Amino acid sequence: SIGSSASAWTDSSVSTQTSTISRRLRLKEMATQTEGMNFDDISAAVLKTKIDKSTQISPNTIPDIVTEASEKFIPNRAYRVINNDDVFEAGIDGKFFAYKVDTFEEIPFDVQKFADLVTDSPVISAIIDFKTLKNLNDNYGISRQQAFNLLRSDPRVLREFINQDNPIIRNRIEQLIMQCRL
Amino acid sequence: EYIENWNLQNRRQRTGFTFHKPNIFPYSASFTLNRSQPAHDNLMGTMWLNAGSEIQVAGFDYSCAINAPANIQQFEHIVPLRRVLTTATITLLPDAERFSFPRVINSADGATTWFFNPVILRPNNVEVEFLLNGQIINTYQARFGTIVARNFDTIRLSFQLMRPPNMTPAVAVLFPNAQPFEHHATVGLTLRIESAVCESVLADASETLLANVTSVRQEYAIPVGPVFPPGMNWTDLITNYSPSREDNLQRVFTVASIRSMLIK
Amino acid sequence: MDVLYSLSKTLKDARDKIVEGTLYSNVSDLIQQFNQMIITMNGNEFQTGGIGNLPIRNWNFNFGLLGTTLLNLDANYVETARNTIDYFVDFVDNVCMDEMVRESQRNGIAPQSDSLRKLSAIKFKRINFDNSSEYIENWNLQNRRQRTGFTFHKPNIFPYSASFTLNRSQPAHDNLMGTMWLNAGSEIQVAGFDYSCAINAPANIQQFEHIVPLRRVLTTATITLLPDAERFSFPRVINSADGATTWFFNPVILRPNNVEVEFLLNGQIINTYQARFGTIVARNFDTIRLSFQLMRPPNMTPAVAVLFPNAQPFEHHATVGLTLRIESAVCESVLADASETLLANVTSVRQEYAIPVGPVFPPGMNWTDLITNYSPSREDNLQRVFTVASIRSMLIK
Amino acid sequence: EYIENWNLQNRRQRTGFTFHKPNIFPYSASFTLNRSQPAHDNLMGTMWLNAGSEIQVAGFDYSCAINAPANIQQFEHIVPLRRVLTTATITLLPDAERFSFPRVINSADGATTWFFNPVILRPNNVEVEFLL
Amino acid sequence: QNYGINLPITGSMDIATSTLCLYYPTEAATEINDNSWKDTLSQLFLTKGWPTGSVYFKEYTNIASFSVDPQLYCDYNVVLMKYDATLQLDMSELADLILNEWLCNPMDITLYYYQQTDEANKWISMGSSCTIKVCPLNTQTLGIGCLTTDATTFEEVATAEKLVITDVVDGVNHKLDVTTATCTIRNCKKLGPRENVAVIQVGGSDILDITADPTTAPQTERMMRINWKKWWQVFYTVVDYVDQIIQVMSKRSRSLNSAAFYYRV
Amino acid sequence: QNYGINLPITGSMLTSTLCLYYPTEAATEINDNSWKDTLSQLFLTKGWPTGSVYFKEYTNIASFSVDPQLYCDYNVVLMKYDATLQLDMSELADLILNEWLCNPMDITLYYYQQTDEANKWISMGSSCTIKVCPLNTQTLGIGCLTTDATTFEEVATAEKLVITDVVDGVNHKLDVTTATCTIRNCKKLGPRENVAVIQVGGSDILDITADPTTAPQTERMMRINWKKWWQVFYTVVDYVDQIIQVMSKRSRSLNSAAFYYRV
Ligand SMILES: [Ca+2]
Ligand SMILES: [Ca+2]
Ligand SMILES: [Ca+2]
Ligand SMILES: [Ca+2]
Ligand SMILES: [Ca+2]
Ligand SMILES: [Ca+2]
Ligand SMILES: [Zn+2]
């Protein structure tokens, strides 16, 4: 029981625990308990695009490719939970952050509170992770609405920044895409 | 004392806090295997617990240094400190009680478990050194009881397992030269800082300042702030005892002393 | 010594009380004492050091008095006061270090440093203020030959001693009866072992006695007595009495039987505790006698029966134990304890300034040797150095 | 401190004494057997010593939870203090050195004696609750 | 992947597909007298959890024939040795050879005199008919109680043996008269235990001595014994407790990737 | 004064001789007249100076059991295992691995009882035949007639060495072939740590304790599997260090006898 209550969702020590919890959280997307975009939304889009492009895909090969894409695309996934002006973000690779929504200032991570929140509260895929968010805030004047939407994984704001040609967000999305390997 | 040290620090004069059993060591129970096999039948290494003011270390060798050079195995244990202690009185005893019993211990990677069945021998060529900036400030060889370290930031404990050159039949049967090692030679040391003086604030066994601050925060459900770890965990505080953490800790401890002057 | 303590106390009061913005009524009497000190010290010259690596320093005193005109102390007043107090505190520090690094085989209670000898003159007696600290209070009582007492938490009374005695033995060390003990600081751990488990002993009981005499009389001591000695409860390979060979010790712990702890003062039974464990009180004693028995269990289950045979091959050795911790005590003499830092301070000053070994204390102020031979001369010197160390720590952090 | 608490108690105000290692636990060295039989060769239970300011407890099982559900055996130890403590600094350590060596213990009724030969494992799911 | 160097491994005390070869004598198959018995045991092992095709059954006519360079290729090997009051030394030597890891170098008895360096070094000879006759030499390289030229004077320490483990006095040169025609003798050194293979003797009274030292005759976990009357019952017992047998055994240390440059197989 | 006994002892926390007893069949198989010299030279390499290792030959276990003699500081006895001689081997091992204090038993005139569990009757001779008759309180026989030997109970027949253990606290009328046997009332003082026995073959069947609940295996009781006596002797020579380390020379007695006689 990592958190206060013993749930099947929440079954360096902090790095290990958060990595395991995030690996389980990957199934929250399948369970449809998320907000905003999803890593598997990006993966499905990339899979469709590549399948349409490819000239060396046979009908007997499509099932294997689809299964591999579902199981492999974006191995490194990060999930965040927002709780009354506090954000807890955890990745499958053992990177965990805790910060304030307004100022993006790091706070000591609380594994127990993170587990309690992630048990039931919606989990937002960190399409724009904390490092990229802080870099973007430092080098650009993110508005309050822009920060809110980026934390909530707003497709509108994400496309807005891509069209504006923000190098930081474009690099982040490019890394996400390139991680869709087989 | 606390307001005295506050004013002295403001005046840039050297401060000083006297602690009984200072809580300077972050809790850390671990082992290191210098020689290992997947079966864990024949192990050599060290096994320690650092907590509060006590270090308990034990070197173990399953072969009892049968093939070691000069029938001697050397174990070392280096414990750094997050803050410099001065004029510390320490009790150094030649056996580690904690690691002198049969144990089943999970392996380094946690995949499996191994059996530790110690038989205690006297530590050999014990050398306890208190070093400041890598320079030996104090050193005591083969001396136990009460010792004094006037100024230091790390402790280096060196000891040896020597195969008894002469053994009675019971001991000879105990230590074979073959593989199956039913009894594993173990030596160890215990080192407790009874009292010390530090330029920075610390928790200790005779004060209640950490308890007061943690109690107030818990009672009023203060959200985790940007400085202290969750729940004012002393292990984390003393592990990453950063300068900002030290500043905030001294402020809160001084306030807690001021409050305890009036509240029971 | 009282003059030195008065200087330290008045400087400490000055640093604590002479702070910006305070009323002059809070510091009127303190400033009168301070001006008395300045007037008594002006025109005198002192010299501290010259032993080992302790530097030789010359101290001169020419200080104007502190004013007596402000309603509330201001920044100027505090600056003047602190500029004077820093010099005075440095002088006190060096006087205390010079006194601590010195010892004498004859008249060890008397001052040894030149500066403290100078301060022992009558002209400085006017700087006496009050003697409120425990150490200075006991210093004065000892000077008056009155009863003294220091309260110690975990007194460091027992010199380190980890040893064993064998009452039955063979060259093979396969059937042994005896005792093992560790006495350190304020802790006694004793174990009585019998390899035969009293199979043939009369009444199937083996008697064990451990007599620990103290080098000083303790009074009103709280003691924790526990029915086992964890330090002698695991397998051991112990080198024999002469170091010629090694013997094996594989203990099995049974409860100690007929436990009697006697606290005797000059051979008279002051306190006796029969089969009582936990917190006990020894009001006055100079020796501890722990008596315990190993009784062969009259009824054994098959496992215990297999453990304890009637033939020679004793694989498991029956063992009983007692632990005795002295939590607090009062001693008319000075000792080292787990709370104070006076032994630490004296040792640290001597080590820092590379003071050569003297004729009184053992090298490096080894507490084990000191308390093993706690001579009256050593006690006088130790009280002197500890009192001056407390005076010093009153000002130096 | 003591006169101040005396006056506060007379006024019926707050009282407080600060203790280093308070002697709050009456001496109690005992054991409880939840599974047992006359041979005392397959025992499950807990043995403890509460003394002064230290609780030292150890749960033992001879079968090592071979037949237990999920290969887990639970142990509990409740120590009720006779007075309410506050702002207490406590040290918790994961082994009971006092119950880690072989020993021979009298039975609950004292009829016979039984052998305890511990091998020490790491306690998992350690929970410490301070209740009021 | 730092191979070939020993780095200390640090762990914390707060933290919390294979194949099975089963060697049996021909007497077992003869008594069973069923052609499908191996398939039956494969299905039973499958129920126990061993996927079909992961259990191999090996047969040897006798301990004497099996001792001729026994090769055990499997993640886990279980040898059903059969006790014989006349073959205690043969069983002990076979068990030592298979249960322990030996690093062996060639011997040229026609070209070099030989001595054993330490207590862990023996001479292992295998073949159709190994007859080992030694002659110790003094400092002058002259035989002690044996004329060097004349081989009859030598001291016979084996005769028509399929397998022999000879332990001569250490530090003294020896001249050997092995029958190289039908025997190969190697200078072997015992490095440690082989966790891959375990022996389950059937019958007898625990008479295996796997240490040259006479003061010690250890009984490791990999050495087991069972009383028997029916080979069907023996095989059922092995199948039913294969979990315990595998737990007693362990994966061969020298075969793991970590063994690279440390005398890997 | 005694050797400082009764006074507590406090502490702080080559020249010897090696006798090697072997059966005749070992020499018969080796068939080399110089094998004793060869073994002495090998012991010299191991570290035993020439003239310090002596080899003793006994025909059989039964013949050796007739009043065995222990000569050197360290004695190493090789007994070949025989499935039908387990009790004889156990008795020989007991006699030579434990110290005994024996007294005469003139059974032709007195009744004898065993005081306690440590007391036994040791019979040694060319051929011994012990017949015992327990006696009740009135001195009459329990299941036997004192005046009729044939009613006595057989406890041993034509045995070179017998260790009889009758019920303690009850007198016995004994009948033995005194002409070819000597019976002694012996007491087991304790282990004799200067004698070790290396059984050759078998399966650890030595029981040196009359108690049935205990069959201990001391460090001085070893076992080896063998096919060549040359290999056995090479093993002994090469591991002489371990064998000696297992035994203590201090237990040697002034007389080369397996027991003390009214000492
Ligand atoms: Ca063979
Ligand atoms: Ca020859
Ligand atoms: Ca050899
Ligand atoms: Ca017989
Ligand atoms: Ca009859
Ligand atoms: Ca009897
Ligand atoms: Zn304390």
Numbering used by the authors:
A (entry chain C): 583 to 593, 606 to 776
B (entry chain o): 134 to 397
C (entry chain n): 1 to 397
D (entry chain m): 134 to 265
E (entry chain O): 51 to 66, 78 to 326
F (entry chain N): 51 to 63, 77 to 326
Paper text:
Rotavirus, a non-turreted member of the Reoviridae, has a triple-layered capsid that is assembled stepwise in two separate compartments in the infected cell: the virus-induced viroplasm and the endoplasmic reticulum (ER). The icosahedral inner layer of the virus, composed of 120 copies of VP2, is in direct contact with the dsRNA genome and encloses 11 copies of the viral polymerase VP1 and a similar but undetermined number of copies of the capping enzyme VP3.2 The intermediate layer consists of 260 homotrimers of VP6 arranged in a T = 13 lattice on the surface of the inner layer. The outermost protein layer consists of 260 trimers of the glycosylated protein VP7, with the inter-subunit interfaces stabilized by Ca2+ ions 2,3 and 60 trimers of VP4 forming spikes which mediate virus attachment and entry. VP4 is a homotrimer of three chains (A–C) associated in an unusual asymmetric arrangement in the infection competent TLP form.
To determine whether the absence of trypsin during the propagation of rotavirus is sufficient to retain the ordered prone head domain, a separate single particle (i.e., not tomographic) analysis was performed on gradient purified TLPs propagated at MOI = 5 without trypsin. Further rounds of focused unaligned classification were performed to enrich for particles with the additional density adjacent to the trunk domain of VP4 resulting in a final class consisting of 30,964 sub-particles which represents 25% of all spike-containing sub-particles. Further 3D refinement followed by masking and sharpening yielded a map at 2.7 Å, which enabled an unambiguous rigid body fitting and refinement of the head domain into the density in the prone chain. This density was higher resolution, but otherwise indistinguishable from that seen on the in situ TLPs. Compared with the upright conformation, the prone head domain is rotated by 117° around y axis slightly offset from the trunk and displaced by 37 Å. Notably, the map enabled modeling of C-terminal residues 222–245 within the trypsin cleavage region of VP4-C head domain. The loop is stabilized by a beta hairpin from the VP4-C trunk domain (residues 414–420), which is folded back compared with its orientation in the two upright monomers (inset). In this alternate conformation, the two domains share an interaction surface of 844 Å2, stabilized via charge complementation as well as hydrophobic interactions centered around residues 298, 318, and 320 on the trunk domain and residues 227 and 234 on the head domain. Taken together, these results reveal the configuration of the VP4-C head domain prior to trypsin cleavage and show that its interaction with the corresponding trunk domain occurs through an alternative set of contacts to those occurring in the A and B chains, displacing the domain to one side, away from the tips of the VP4-C trunk domain.
